[PDB]
Amino acid sequence: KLCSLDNGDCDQFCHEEQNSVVCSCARGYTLADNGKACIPTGPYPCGKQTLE
Amino acid sequence: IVGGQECKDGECPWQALLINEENEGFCGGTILSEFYILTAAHCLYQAKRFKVRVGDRNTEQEEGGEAVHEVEVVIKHNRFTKETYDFDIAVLRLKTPITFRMNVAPACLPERDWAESTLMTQKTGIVSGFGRTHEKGRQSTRLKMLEVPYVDRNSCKLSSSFIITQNMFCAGYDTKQEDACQGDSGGPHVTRFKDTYFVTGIVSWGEGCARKGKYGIYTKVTAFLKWIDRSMKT
Numbered sequence: 001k002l003c004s005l006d007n008g009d010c011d012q013f014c015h016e017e018q019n020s021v022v023c024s025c026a027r028g029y030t031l032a033d034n035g036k037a038c039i040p041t042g043p044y045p046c047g048k049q050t051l052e
Numbered sequence: 053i054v055g056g057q058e059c060k061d062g063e064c065p066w067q068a069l070l071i072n073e074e075n076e077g078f079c080g081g082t083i084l085s086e087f088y089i090l091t092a093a094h095c096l097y098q099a100k101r102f103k104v105r106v107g108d109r110n111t112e113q114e115e116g117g118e119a120v121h122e123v124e125v126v127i128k129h130n131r132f133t134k135e136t137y138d139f140d141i142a143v144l145r146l147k148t149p150i151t152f153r154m155n156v157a158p159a160c161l162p163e164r165d166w167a168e169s170t171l172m173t174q175k176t177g178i179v180s181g182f183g184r185t186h187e188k189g190r191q192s193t194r195l196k197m198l199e200v201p202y203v204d205r206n207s208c209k210l211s212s213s214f215i216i217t218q219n220m221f222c223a224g225y226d227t228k229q230e231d232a233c234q235g236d237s238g239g240p241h242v243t244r245f246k247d248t249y250f251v252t253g254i255v256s257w258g259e260g261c262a263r264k265g266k267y268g269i270y271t272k273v274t275a276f277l278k279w280i281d282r283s284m285k286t
């Protein structure tokens with residue numbers, strides 16, 4: 001299943017390499033230590049509503 | 053936007069408004085970064101000289117966080133033609149960078165395969181704009197948004213009098229009388245994925261607005277990611 005199973009548990013981009021899930025993030029985000037979550041590098045990261 | 057809801061504070065921060073010499077909004081745009089706006093190529097024929105308004109939600113009131121940006125470079129797709137409305141995409145490079153703040157933030161550009169398998173396969177996307185609130189009407193003074201179901205590609209082709217190319221996609225309702233309209237052109241169609249909004253479309257055209265058995269036609273952003281990436285380096 002990999003990327004077809006809940007986006008491979010990635011926050012954002014899910015890729016398949018050697019029958020394994022590889023997560024990546026858009027610009028302005030850094031991939032977290034767990035290699036799944038995407039952390040904003042600074043204020044106003046892309047795609048976030050400014051509700052606060 | 054016909055129907056839908058007003059964009060509340062901080063809800064549609066990627067929305068840009070193209071304004072003519074008379075300071076009236078005529079098309080939308082999407083903030084991609086501090087120097088770049090994504091819009092429709094056909095919007096560039098709607099005004100001789102135009103500027104970009106960001107952080108604007110109400111065109112009657114000055115919003116403080118609201119700013120006017122001049123266009124330095126217009127990057128228009130050479131393949132666009134009024135006969136087909138194919139390749140309805142343009143990138144604008146601004147003279148000064150946008151200050152991101154409440155109501156001003158870029159939408160994410162997804163990667164092609166993931167957008168197609170993951171974003172495009174979600175039930176819905178969100179279209180927003182200052183366009184007409186009824187097929188026959190004036191431009192809205194309020195920024196509106198509307199959740200629009202992704203429309204099956206076959207149903208899309210059958211619904212239309214015109215050729216739906218591979219650079220286009222349908223979204224909207226068959227019966228429910230809510231859709232994007234004139235003046236929303238160039239604006240965002242974004243898809244939410246785990247609380248992150250990715251730009252998936254550019255309001256392109258439609259046969260009327262909110263007509264039964266008809267849909268909003270969007271430029272498919274995935275078909276132009278390399279061209280967009282390239283435009284941002286130049």
Ligand SMILES: CS(=O)(=O)c1ccccc1-c1ccc(N2CCc3c(C(F)(F)F)nn(-c4cccc(-c5n[nH]c(=O)[nH]5)c4)c3C2=O)cc1
Nearest residue numbers: 135136137214231232233234256257258260261262267268
């Ligand atoms: C050039 S062509 O050879 O015809 C051709 C050749 C080949 C392909 C397309 C075309 C083509 C057909 C119709 C149009 N037109 C027709 C008139 C109109 C009006 C109106 F009615 F307000 F005037 N609004 N509007 C508009 C604008 C933006 C969104 C929506 C929308 N989104 N969702 C939804 O339901 N509507 C509606 C249009 C529009 O796109 C423009 C071009």
Ligand code: NA
Nearest residue numbers: 108110111113
């Ligand atoms: Na305003």
Ligand code: NA
Nearest residue numbers: 225262263266
């Ligand atoms: Na419809």
